[PDB]
Design a protein around this ligand. Structure first.
Ligand code: HEM
Ligand SMILES: OC[C@H]1O[C@H](O[C@H]2[C@H](O)[C@@H](O)[C@H](OCCCCCC3CCCCC3)O[C@@H]2CO)[C@H](O)[C@@H](O)[C@@H]1O
Ligand SMILES: OC[C@H]1O[C@H](O[C@H]2[C@H](O)[C@@H](O)[C@H](OCCCCCC3CCCCC3)O[C@@H]2CO)[C@H](O)[C@@H](O)[C@@H]1O
Length: 459
C-alpha cells in the first residue's frame, strides 16, 4: 500500500539503488524511475519521499496535521534524543513551539538586527577595501542575533573565546553535511561503534551544551522576575510556574536542547544564504546595481534600512527570494513522520513512517519557475514590477512544521543585504563569467564555494 519503489535487501535496504553522489542525487534519480512519491529503504527504515511542489503541498498543507511529525537525524540524535523544539514530537513539540514562537515574538528583533548591521558595516569599513573571505563575519552576525535572543547579549567580532566556540560550532555543520554523515544516516546502528565524524559532531555539540549550561546558571543567579532579559529568563520563569507539575515539558533538558535547537537551525542556514547571495551578486553586477538604485530611491544614503522599507522594494525582495530559491540550502528538508495511518495519493503510510519533503524539487519546479536553473528575479515579479509570490517557493518548508524562524530569517536577509549594499559596492579577483555557483559540499545543507570579496565604501 506504500508508494512504489525498489525492492529492499534485508539490513541494507535500497543501498544498491542509491547513487555514490549522496542522498539528494539518490532521490532525484529514483524519482525519474518511480514518479513523484516513492518509498526508499534507508537501512531497514522505509522512507517516503515527496517530490515536486504539488505532492509536497498535498502532504504538508492539505494534510497538515497528518504530516506534522518530526524524524531523526542520525548524527545529532545522540545529542537531541527527541528533546527541544526541533526534534520533539506530539505534546512536547506543541508546548515548546507555542512557547518559543511567543517568546521570540516579544529591544525588538528588528532593532537588534539593525544594530548588528551597524556593527558589521563599522567592521567592514576598517578593512579599507581589502580582500576578505566573508564566511567568518557572516557566521558572527548570524550567531550574534541568536545570542541576543537567547543570552540577551552579543559578542565582538575579535573576541577570541567567542571565535573558538564559533570555529567548532561551524565546523560541525560541514561534518553533518559530509558524505560520511550521509552514510551514517543509513547504517549508524553498525557504525556508531567505530570512530567517525559522528563522534566529532557529538563532542562539538556537547561543548556547546556545556557553555549553554553555564549561561543558564548565570541567568538564574542574576534573574529579575520583573524584567525578563531574553529567552532563558522567560524559560526559567515558566520552569518556576510549573515547579509542581511533573508532566510539564518545561524542564532543564528541554531548556538546554531548545537553546541549542535555536542555534542549530538559525545560524548556518542564514549565514550561508548571505554568503551565497553575495556570491550571486558578484556574478551578476546588473542585478547588484539594480538593488543599489532601489535602495537609493526608497532609502537613500543616510538612514539605516528598516523592515518597513521591504514592502516598498519589490525588486530587492524579488532578488532575496530568488537567492533563497537557487541557494537551496536544505535540499531534502528536515525529516518528517506521519502522526497516524495516512491515506495519500492512493497509498497508505503506516503511522510513524518517515517523510522527506524534497524541498529542492519545489524550488526548481518548472511548472512555477521559467528558468529553474538560472538566477532570474523575474520569477517573483509580475508585469507591473510588483512582487508576486509563487507556490514553488518553499525554502522554509510548509504546514505545521514551517520554519519557526521564517520572520527572523527574512528580516536578517533583508536588513543585512540592504544595509551592506547601501554602504558598499563589491568586487572580486574572479571575473563574473568565471564565477562558479555549483556547491562544493552538498548534504542536508548545501554549501557554496568559498571565495574572496572586497567591500568598497561608497560616495
Ligand atoms: C535562511 C534561514 C533559514 C532557513 C532556509 C530555514 C529553513 C528551515 C526548514 C526547511 C525547516 C524545516 C521545517 C520542516 O520540518 O519541514 C526549518 C525548521 C526550523 N527552523 Fe528554520 N530556517 C532558517 C532559519 C531559522 C532561524 C533564524 C531560526 C530561529 C532563530 C529557525 C528555527 C527553526 C526551528 C526551531 C525549526 C524546527 C521547526 C519545528 O520542528 O517545529 N530557522 N527551518
Ligand atoms: O555497468 C554498471 C554496473 O554497475 C551496477 O552497479 C550498481 C552498483 O552495484 C552500485 O554500487 C552503484 O551504487 C553506488 C553505491 C551507492 C552507495 C552510496 C550511498 C552512500 C550513503 C548516501 C548516498 C548513497 O549503482 C549501480 C547502478 O547500476 C551493477 O552492479 C551492474 O548491474 C551494472 O551493469
Ligand atoms: O573575570 C571573567 C570576566 O570575563 C567574562 O567573559 C565571559 C563572558 O561573560 C561569557 O559570555 C563568554 O562567552 C564567550 C563565548 C560565546 C559563545 C556563543 C556561541 C554559541 C554557538 C554559536 C556561536 C556563538 O565567556 C567569557 C569568559 O571569560 C565577562 O566578560 C566578565 O563579566 C567576567 O568578569
Amino acid at each position: 500500500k506504500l508508494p512504489p519503489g525498489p525492492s529492499p535487501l534485508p539490513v541494507l535496504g535500497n543501498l544498491l539503488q542509491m547513487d555514490r553522489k549522496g542522498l539528494l542525487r539518490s532521490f532525484l534519480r529514483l524519482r525519474e524511475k518511480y514518479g513523484d512519491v516513492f518509498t526508499v529503504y534507508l537501512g531497514s527504515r522505509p522512507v517516503v519521499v515527496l517530490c515536486g511542489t504539488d505532492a509536497i503541498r498535498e502532504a504538508l498543507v492539505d494534510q497538515a496535521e497528518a504530516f506534522s511529525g518530526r524524524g531523526k537525524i542520525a548524527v545529532v540524535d545522540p545529542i537531541f534524543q527527541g528533546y527541544g523544539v526541533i526534534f520533539a514530537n506530539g505534546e512536547r513539540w506543541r508546548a515548546l513551539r507555542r512557547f518559543s514562537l511567543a517568546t521570540m515574538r516579544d529591544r525588538s528583533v528588528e532593532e537588534r538586527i539593525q544594530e548588528e548591521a551597524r556593527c558589521l558595516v563599522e567592521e567592514l569599513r576598517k578593512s579599507k577595501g581589502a580582500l576578505l573571505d566573508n564566511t567568518l563575519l557572516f557566521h558572527s552576525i548570524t550567531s550574534n542575533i541568536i545570542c541576543s535572543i537567547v543570552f540577551g547579549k552579543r559578542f565582538d567580532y575579535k573576541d577570541p573565546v567567542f571565535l573558538r566556540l564559533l570555529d567548532l560550532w561551524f565546523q560541525s555543520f560541514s561534518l553533518i553535511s559530509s558524505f560520511s554523515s550521509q552514510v551514517f544516516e543509513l547504517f549508524s546502528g553498525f557504525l556508531k561503534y567505530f570512530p567517525g565524524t559522528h563522534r566529532q559532531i557529538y563532542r562539538n555539540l556537547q561543548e556547546i551544551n556545556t557553555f549553554i549550561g553555564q549561561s543558564v546558571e548565570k541567568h538564574r543567579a542574576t534573574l529579575d522576575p520583573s524584567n525578563p532579559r531574553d529567552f532563558i529568563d522567560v524559560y526559567l520563569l515558566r520552569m518556576e510556574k510549573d515547579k509542581s507539575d511533573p508532566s510539564s515539558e518545561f524542564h532543564h533538558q528541554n531548556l538546554i536542547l531548545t537553546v541549542l535547537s535555536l542555534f542549530f537551525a538559525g545560524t548556518e542556514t542564514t549565514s550561508t544564504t548571505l554568503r551565497y547571495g553575495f556570491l550571486l551578486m558578484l556574478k551578476y553586477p546588473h542585478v547588484t546595481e539594480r538593488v543599489q538604485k532601489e535602495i537609493e530611491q526608497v532609502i537613500g544614503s543616510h538612514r539605516p534600512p528598516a523592515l518597513d522599507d521591504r514592502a516598498k522594494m519589490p525588486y530587492t525582495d524579488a532578488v532575496i527570494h530568488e537567492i533563497q530559491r537557487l541557494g537551496d540550502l536544505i535540499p531534502f528538508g528536515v525529516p518528517h513522520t506521519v502522526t497516524k495511518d495516512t491515506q495519500f495519493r492512493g497509498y497508505v503510510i503506516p503511522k510513524n513512517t518517515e517523510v522527506f519533503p524534497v524541498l529542492s524539487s519545489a524550488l526548481h519546479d518548472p511548472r512555477y519557475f521559467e528558468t529553474p536553473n538560472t538566477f532570474n528575479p523575474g520569477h517573483f515579479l509580475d508585469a507591473n514590477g510588483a512582487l508576486k509570490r509563487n507556490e514553488g517557493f518553499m525554502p522554509f518548508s510548509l504546514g505545521k512544521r514551517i520554519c519557526l524562524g521564517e520572520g527572523i530569517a527574512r528580516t536578517e536577509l533583508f536588513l543585512f543585504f540592504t544595509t551592506i549594499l547601501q554602504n558598499f559596492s563589491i568586487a572580486s579577483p574572479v571575473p563574473p563569467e568565471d564565477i562558479d555557483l555549483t556547491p562544493r559540499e552538498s548534504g542536508v545543507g548545501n554549501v557554496p564555494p568559498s571565495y574572496q570579496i572586497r567591500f568598497l565604501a561608497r560616495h
